[PDB]
Each structure stands twice: as C-alpha cells, then as structure tokens.
Design a protein around this ligand. Structure first.
Ligand code: 58J
Ligand code: 58J
Ligand code: BR
Ligand code: BR
Ligand code: BR
Ligand code: BR
Ligand code: NI
Ligand code: NI
Lengths: 287, 287
C-alpha cells in the first residue's frame, strides 16, 4: 500500500490525521511552482559556495551527510520567498496547530535546502533528531510527536533519482527487528509537493542511480517551542526581521512562546513581558 | 531523616550523587556572603518597581504566584555579581556536567530573585516546569532529570519565615497517593546556602508565620540546551554580553550548543558555524 496523497487545498483537515495514522502523507502542490522557482533562484549561489558538510573550517561539522551533499540553513536573510511565502503558509500552520495543540506554540527547528549530487547513495534507514535532541529518545512510546518534517521537492523526486523511502506505520514501532528496505515505499513527487513525516517515522533519502540527475529539497522541521532549534536567527539583521509578519517572527525565535498548560507562564519572556513588546519589535516594514 | 547537608568546597563530587538518590541536598556556602550582599544591593530597586505577578500591563502574566510575591528575572543586565560570579560558579558547573552529561550542554532556563512578603502562604506541593514545559510530563519515569533548581537563600530560611519543604525520594515517585505536608522536611539555610532539587522533586515554599519577616531567594533553574528557557536575553545590550566569559555567554543563549550524541550536529548553529564565530562575538571586554 502506497503513501497517501492529499490536496493542500481541499484535503487540508485530513492531512495531520493521515500522518498520525500512517506516519507519512504526500501534500500535492504544498508550494506553488512560482514559490519553488523564486526559492531555487535565491538559494542557488549559496548552494554553490557551501563547503562540504564536515569542512575543517567549521566548528559544528556534520559528519553524517555525504561529502557530495550541500545543506544551506538560516534561509530567512537569503530568500524573500521563504521568509514571506513559506513561513506564512496557511497549510503548514493548520497542520502544525493540529499536530502540536497538546504541547502549545511551535517554531522552525530547521529550514534547510539540501542538494544531493549525482550517484549520492541511499541514507541508512533512521528517525530524525537523534544527532541533536537525545531527550526525544527518553519520551514515552505513546507521547505525541514533538517535531514533524516537511520534505518539499524543489526538483522532481523519482525512484531513479533517489526519491525518499518511508515505512508506513513505523512511527508506532517500538521493536525495530523488521526494519528493512524490503518494507519501504517511495515518495514520488513533482516540485512543490511535500512528504510530511514525524520525528518517529523510519525513512531514508533514496540512492541516485542515473549518475546525471541533481536532486534538491527544502526540509522544514517544525517542532514545539519547548525544543531548541538546530539553527539560530540571532545574527539575522533587525531590518529583515521587522519586514516579516508577527507569525513569521515567532517561528524564527524573535518572539516569546506559550505552552498549552492551562495557566501557562510562557517561554523566552522578560519579567512577565514578551520579546516583541520589550524591544518594541515592528512587523511588515518593507525593507 | 533530614535533607543531607554538604560543603560546596570539600564535598563537591558528592553533591549530584546525593540529589540523584534523595531528590534534594543543602549546599552550605554555595555563594560567599560578599556575592549575596552585592546581588541583594543590585536587584533591590528592581524588586520594588516589579508589578504584581499577574499585572494587567503584562502580556505573559503569572497567575500562580501570590499577588504579594515579586519575581525579577533576566538578571544579567542588572547584576555584575550574577553575570560574573554566579554564571561562572565552579560548584554550579561541576554539579551541572555531573547531572547532564548523558544529554550534553546545559544553560539557564531561568535565573530569578523572588521576594515573598510577610504572611505569604505555603505553595501547594508541586513539581517545577508544569506551567512552561508540558513535554517533561511525557518523559519515561526513569529518564534522567532534564532540569535542576538551585534555591539559593539571599536571606535566612527558618521554619518560622517559610523555609522550603521537600519530600525526600519523591523524585522517583510515580504513584502520588502519599503526597502530604506530613511527609515533608525543611530546608533551614543561612544566606549563601542553596537547596538543590530536580524537576521531579515534590516540594513547596513554606508559610511565612512571623507576620514581619521578608524572605528572598535566587532560584537558578539549570537545564539541557535542548529545552527552551523561560526567560530571554535577546534584548540584553551586546556590550554587556561581550563583558562575560564564553561559558557565561553560552548559559544566556548567546552561543551555539552541543548534544551528547556521538556525531552531534549541534543546536543554534549557522550553516555549520557557531553563533559566536559568525557574529565575531568578543568575551571579557570590561564595559
Ligand atoms: C547519510 O545518512 C543520514 C544523514 C542524515 C540523517 C539525519 C539527520 C538528522 O537527524 N536531522 C536532520 C534534519 C534535517 C536535515 C538534515 C538532518 C541531518 O543532517 N541529519 C544528520 C540520517 C542519515
Ligand atoms: C504559589 O504556588 C506555586 C507557585 C509557583 C509554582 C511553580 C512554578 C514553576 O513551575 N516554575 C517556576 C520556576 C522558578 C521560579 C518560579 C516558577 C513559577 O513561577 N511557577 C509558577 C508552584 C506553586
Ligand atoms: Br546525504
Ligand atoms: Br530525502
Ligand atoms: Br508564591
Ligand atoms: Br521556596
Ligand atoms: Ni531523515
Ligand atoms: Ni517549585
């Protein structure tokens, strides 16, 4: 049985309940082709200048990604398309509030463009967050997902060019003795489609087998405001931050956050006041 | 059997193992009387101007604390004693690395001075973090503590003036049917002494019964860098931040963080580089 495919528009209310049951769902046209084009254009140069993931110049090397793989994060100051269109996506926010209502507010743990070179091997079958958030492994088996991953196609995803593998129902697995590529199904997607998985879904990047095709994806890990993001926006110029919506500002950690606790005392507060109130942080000021 | 009392100096290695077994330990002379005096002096005015915890002017009201209670957090820009002496405490850092080695880096979830007025009632018996981090309630019963609380006496703690109550062994309790003030013992302390509890230790602020005494404490919640702090240092002037040690800077979230994962990819990074490297953040520049 294949990965369930849903309309971003007409099947909006069905998307999270589908992921909660099956551990994966394809969101058809998650981003318009216009947004994909503008996103591809803005990140293109930064992909090319990006050193190898485990560069000796880096003080936080990624020793896991293929040496041919390029990951570009902190996209806000690079991409008008990302910081305006993607951060304000009505579909992403309905899904996130559906997923995270039991915990409270959510924000971006990481928004990264990844480019995978021709002949990039398949990743080992894995769950995300194990190289950054050891805490996640100490949660009760039945604990609701504290993070989810929108794997957005920025180029075609085919079995040939290394489309994502998922094991359906694997997000509910405690015994991992049946973990095999034999058990996987593929995420076949056009640019703008998104594969949505949880932090518990067993999955892997597919093997690039054409030897010619470059695969690119926008990976948006959304998580509860109680978990620390992989990436920082602390160094993003204040002018760029003050050009965003209040919603987009909160997702980048440039606002206080709230838990779902009946009498919440809040996160990232300043003597009972919010970041945005204290600093007199403006919003929607065109640069 | 009473709360175990240990020397900050000669019993350093014994402190965390004592808390892990009993759920509480008194650290005698955790801060020198000089540091307490300088801390009391610097915060004094900010305590007096602090509105009631649930002020209608506040966008993050605390509806839990007594209306007579005053809490002052984000202490770094207020107190030279706090940002230099307390944030660099050799005893606090040995205890925190002992406690949190399984998770990775740790930082300040909140450093607050609390002043409790004459005739302040005893708090209900509780565990901390339940009004800010719902996630903590979904951790496995045996999961190591993700946060700990140094309750430092800034004035004398007596049974008369509302010294802290703790139930010893209560940090290992799953069944809460025996939770009663009958089961508690008191934290009798001179200024500079600290009661160290975990996020699981059942405890409460004592009742002020003299009708004359004002009790004050410095509460330092230390937690793994994977959990979001209650308070923000985002609005702290860069000159003040650049006057701290690199260690103190990390504790305030003005640096990238690392997990204990063998091939850690890190937290609050910028395209494989740290906050401090990217921003060229200086340290120990006297204002
Ligand atoms: C070649 O095999 C791999 C490579 C990566 C992972 C998984 C991760 C991870 O857990 N988190 C993220 C989340 C978003 C984007 C990237 C990553 C990432 O870098 N790693 C290391 C697994 C297997
Ligand atoms: C009158 O009864 C109470 C009042 C407070 C708590 C507990 C908390 C809490 O969970 N976290 C902290 C941590 C440090 C300092 C203060 C607080 C705080 O404000 N609350 C609400 C319990 C019982
Ligand atoms: Br890879
Ligand atoms: Br992938
Ligand atoms: Br109180
Ligand atoms: Br107390
Ligand atoms: Ni993955
Ligand atoms: Ni408490």
């Amino acid at each position: 049985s294949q990965i369930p495919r849903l309309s971003a528009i007409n099947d909006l209310h069905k998307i999270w309940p589908t992921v909660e049951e099956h551990g994966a769902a394809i969101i058809e046209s998650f981003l318009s082709l216009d947004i994909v084009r503008r996103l591809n254009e803005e990140v293109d140069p930064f992909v090319k200048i990006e050193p190898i993931p485990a560069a000796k110049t880096k003080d936080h090397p990624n020793h896991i990604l293929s040496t041919t793989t390029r990951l570009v994060n902190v996209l806000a100051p690079i991409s008008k398309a990302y910081r305006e269109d993607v951060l304000n996506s009505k579909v992403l926010h309905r899904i996130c509030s559906d997923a995270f209502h039991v915990y409270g507010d959510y924000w971006v743990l990481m928004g990264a463009v990844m480019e995978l070179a021709p002949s990039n091997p398949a990743q080992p079958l894995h769950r995300d967050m194990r190289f950054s958030h050891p805490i996640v492994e100490y949660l009760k088996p039945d604990a609701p997902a504290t993070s989810i991953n929108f794997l957005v196609a920025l180029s075609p995803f085919t079995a040939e060019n290394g489309a994502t593998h998922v094991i359906l129902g694997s997000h509910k697995w405690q015994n991992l003795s049946n973990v095999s590529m034999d058990a996987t199904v593929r995420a076949l997607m056009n640019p703008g489609d998104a594969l949505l998985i949880t932090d518990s879904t067993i999955h892997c990047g597919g093997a690039e087998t054409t030897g010619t095709e470059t695969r690119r994806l926008l990976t948006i890990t959304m998580g509860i405001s109680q978990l620390t993001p992989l990436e920082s926006n602390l160094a993003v110029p204040r002018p760029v931050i003050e050009s965003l919506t209040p919603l987009a500002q909160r997702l980048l950690g440039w606002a206080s956050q709230r838990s779902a606790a009946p009498r919440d005392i809040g996160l990232l507060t300043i003597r009972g006041n919010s970041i945005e109130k204290t600093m007199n942080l403006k919003a929607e000021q065109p640069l």
